[PDB]
Amino acid sequence: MKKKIGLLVMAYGTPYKEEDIERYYTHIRRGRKPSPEMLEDLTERYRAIGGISPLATITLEQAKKLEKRLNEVQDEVEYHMYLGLKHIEPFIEDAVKEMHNDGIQDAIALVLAPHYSTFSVKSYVGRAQEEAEKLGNLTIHGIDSWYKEPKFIQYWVDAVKSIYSGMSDAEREKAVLIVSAHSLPEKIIAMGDPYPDQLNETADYIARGAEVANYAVGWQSAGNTPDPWIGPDVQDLTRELNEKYGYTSFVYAPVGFVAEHLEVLYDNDFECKVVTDEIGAKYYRPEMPNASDAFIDCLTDVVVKKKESVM
């Protein structure tokens, strides 16, 4: 009776121990080992945010809680979960290989990032489908995005509601909600990538449902290339809006991310707080979804919806 469906959950990956940092950075750099200088900086950023190990368990927990919740909320299908990471074990290819050996014929692929981009599609779903065809008899169905999902927007609306309801009505007038995601090279825009458009819309839904008067979209974690990346960066954006609009409070909602990883704990909690402390302004950053049960229930719906579209 229970149709066995594979659940391929994907993410970027993160070092498990400190002696993973090197080979992790190496993989990220297309196999090009990092220099002593760059390695020490990376290592230092991890020390600053309180270590690499607490970050490592969030992704797997998300995956595992999702597997359990899915097989509870419905009787029709048995979901068998497999985790594939981009830059560390278990790699995407070793995950889809296991899925093949177990006899899984159809699998639903879910990226742990709400927005569509060409980077994501080719990094995850496209990479997974390259082994699926190589081995034969396995069809992977990719979820394009899930930012418009009612329980995703409600999570962040609720999260932002908390912070704003503890503000004085005066501070509320001098506060701005800054909505962000990981930056990508600007080339994608000319190419037709609707990623910045999807983030813009996400900001509109969250601000509206939270009843927040002022908001703005920003970007973070841009790489180091000669090619320009999508801006403005959150650090620069903070200074600009404080200048022409005089915001003395900034609420960072890094909506492209689902977890407190290096990008949130450093790029927001460290680097943005530096900007706010300068301009004489207050800093707020609400809880990331991480493995919270309300987030898992959101992911359960996106997977039930996708299955209903795939039968």
Feature table: binding site for Fe-coproporphyrin III? 12, 29, 45-46, 53, 124
How many angstroms separate the CA atoms of 178 and 105, rounded?
Answer: 43
Q: Look-up: residue for tokens 């970050």? A: 55
> Is residue 90 reached through a cis peptide bond, with omega within 30 degrees of 0 on the bond before it?
yes
- Alpha-carbon distance of 127 to 92, in angstroms, equals 8
β-bridge mates for residue 215, sequence order: 177
Q: What pairing do the DSSP bridges indicate for beta strands 215-220 and 175-182?
A: parallel
Across the beta sheet with 249-253, the strand order is: 215-220, 175-182, 249-253, 282-284
Compute CA distances 291 → 54, 64, 173, 252, 285, whole Å. 13, 9, 33, 19, 17
Report the distance separating Cα 155 and Cα 146, nearest Å. 13
Strands 139-142 vs 106-111: parallel, antiparallel or unpaired? parallel
Angle between helices 125-135 and 92-101 (to 10 degrees): 40
**Helix orientation angle between 36-48 and 21-28, rounded to the nearest 10 degrees:** 120
Rounded-to-integer distance, Cα 258 and Cα 269, Å? 15
Binding residues for Fe(2+): 182, 263
Tell me which residue of 206, 215, 139, 209 sits closest to 172, measured CA to CA: 215
Give the span between the Cα atoms of 166 and 23, in whole angstroms.
Answer: 44
7 in helix, strand or coil? strand
CA distance 311 to 305: 10
Strands 215-220 and 249-253: unpaired
On whether the CB atoms of residues 189 and 231 are closer than 8 A, the answer is no
Residues tagged in the binding site annotation: 12, 29, 45-46, 53, 124, 182, 263
- Resolution of the experimental structure, in angstroms: 2.1
Element (H, E) at 282: strand 282-284
**Alpha-carbon span 297 to 311, nearest angstrom:** 21
- Locus of tokens 């692929």: 109
How many CB atoms lie under 10 A from the CB of residue 266? Answer: 18
Cα-Cα end-to-end distance for the chain: 14
How many whole angstroms separate alpha carbon 27 and alpha carbon 46? Answer: 18
Angle between helices 195-210 and 150-165 (to 10 degrees): 50
- Rounded Cα–Cα distance for residues 184 and 178 (Å): 18
Tokens of residue 145, six digits = 């995005």
Among 307, 296, 234, which residue's Cα sits nearest to residue 271? 234
The encoded tokens of residue 14 equal: 């993160």
- Every domain of the chain with CATH number 3.40.50.1400 lies at 1-146+289-311, 147-288
Structure-block tokens of residue 25 = 């950075």
Cα gap 152→290, rounded to integer Å: 12
Collapsing DSSP to helix, strand or coil, 4 comes out as strand
Show the tokens assigned to 123: 């990094």
Interacting residues of 43 by C-beta distance below 8 A, sequence separation 6+: 18, 21
Identify whether the C-beta of residue 59 lies closer than 8 Å to the C-beta of residue 112: yes
Unique residue bearing structure tokens 């022409």: 244
Query: 1-146+289-311: which CATH number, 1.10.1740.10, 2.40.50.180, 3.40.50.1400, 3.40.50.720?
Result: 3.40.50.1400
Q: How many Å separate Cα 82 from the centre of its chain? A: 18
Sign of the alpha-carbon dihedral angle for 89, 90, 92, 98 = positive
The DSSP string of 89-145 is: SSBHHHHHHHHHHTT--EEEEEESSSS--HHHHHHTHHHHHHHHHHHSS-EEEE---
Fold of 147-288: Rossmann fold (3.40.50)
Task: Say if strands 106-111 and 175-182 run parallel, antiparallel, or are unpaired.
Answer: unpaired
User: Which spans in 166-194 are helix H?
Assistant: 169-173, 187-191
Residue 4 CB coordination number (10 Å) = 14
As to burial, measured by CB atoms within 10 angstroms (0-12 exposed, 13-18 middle, 19+ buried), residue 176 is: buried
Give Cα 216 distance to the centre of its chain. 19
**Residue 138 near residue 284, CB atoms below 8 Å:** no
Distances (CA, A) of 303 to 2, 58, 307: 16, 19, 6
Question: Which residues make Cβ contacts (< 8 Å) with residue 112, sequence separation at least 6?
Answer: 9, 10, 11, 59, 62, 258, 259
Q: Which is nearest to 96 in space by CA: 60, 122, 134?
A: 134
Write down the residue that tokens 């945010």 correspond to. Answer: 49
Distance CA 16, CA 176 (A): 36
Distance (Å, whole) CA 281 – CA 293: 33
Provide the token pair at 116: 């569509």
Overall residue count recorded for the chain in this entry: 311
Q: Where are the alpha helices (DSSP H) in the chain?
A: 21-28, 36-48, 53-73, 92-101, 118-123, 125-135, 150-165, 169-173, 187-191, 195-210, 234-245, 262-265, 271-279, 293-308
